[PDB]
């Protein structure tokens, strides 16, 4: 059982120019993607300060990069709070919006594209990169589901059969054709050291055979 929905029209359009502006700083998604991990991480551990049942589903609290060049894909992993169902139909759990007003807004106003998580849409640089967005995820009060959307309007949400993740989310980024640099060990080391050093959870670049 597979859903279909469409976007708002204001996400439709935020991710419409996020595909088709000439930008040429792609590389800040990944600072935005660890940054959304690490304000996830950051509510797991807030909810675990009263209720420590809250990790029974995971002690570990990290972001692992995993990249992949047979499948052309690029992973975040974290294992913070997760989202439900209504949060993954709900813009992934963002004022997504409200935030695209704001955000467009500003860039009239003067502001630039890598400022997009200061409106609280960061997650939708993932489209600077990628051509299709594929998000798992468990939080403790669902079940496990798959998000995905390669823009045009619309995602699809299903429940996941792949490997259980305990808690957490995995933003799988299929990359575009000509954004392959991004699965070069050197080259995510260079951007998470540029953009990401003080993160305060462990960052883990896997590699690959």
Known sequence: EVETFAFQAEIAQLMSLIINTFYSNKEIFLRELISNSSDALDKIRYESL?????LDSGKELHINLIPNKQDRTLTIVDTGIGMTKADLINNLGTIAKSGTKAFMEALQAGADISMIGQFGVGFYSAYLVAEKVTVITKHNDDEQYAWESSAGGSFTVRTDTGEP??????????????QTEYLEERRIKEIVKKHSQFIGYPITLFVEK
């Open 50 to 54: 009263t209720d420590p049942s809250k």
């Open 165 to 178: 993740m305990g808690r957490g989310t995995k933003v799988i980024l299929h990359l575009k054709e000509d």
